[PDB]
């Protein structure tokens, strides 16, 4: 499943590590757990 990386801090969201919850299901108020930016500052990776 499509992984995304934080442009600012390099954190990588891998659905497989979160019970197969895809990036597109995360809430509008979700932010990077390392640096706090919103989903719009992530890139497919
Ligand atoms: Fe980040």
* Pair of tokens at residue 16: 């497989």
Helix/strand/coil for 40: helix
Domain count, the chain: 1
> How many angstroms is it from 28 CA to the middle of ligand 1?
15
CATH value at residue 43 = 2.20.28.10
User: What are the beta bridge partners of residue 38?
Assistant: 31
- CA atoms of 22 and 8, how far apart (whole Å): 20
User: What are the beta bridge partners of residue 44?
Assistant: 4
Q: Is 32 annotated as a binding residue?
A: yes
Q: Is 44 exposed, middle or buried (0-12, 13-18, 19+ CB in 10 A)?
A: exposed
Domain enclosing residue 12, as ranges: 1-45
| Contacts within 8 Å (CB) and 24+ apart, 34-40 | 34/6, 34/9, 35/6, 35/8, 35/9, 35/11, 37/6, 37/7, 37/8, 37/9, 39/4
- Which experimental technique did the depositors report for determining this structure? X-ray
> How many angstroms is it from 5 CA to the middle of ligand 1?
8
Q: Is 31 annotated as a binding residue?
A: no
> How many angstroms is it from 27 CA to the middle of ligand 1?
16
User: What is the enclosing helix (H) or strand (E) of 43?
Assistant: strand 42-44
């Amino acid at each position: 499943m499509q992984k995304y990386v934080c442009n600012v801090c390099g954190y990588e969201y891998d659905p497989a590590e979160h019970d197969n919850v895809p990036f597109d299901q995360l809430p509008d108020d979700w932010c990077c757990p390392v640096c706090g930016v919103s989903k719009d500052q992530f890139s497919p990776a």
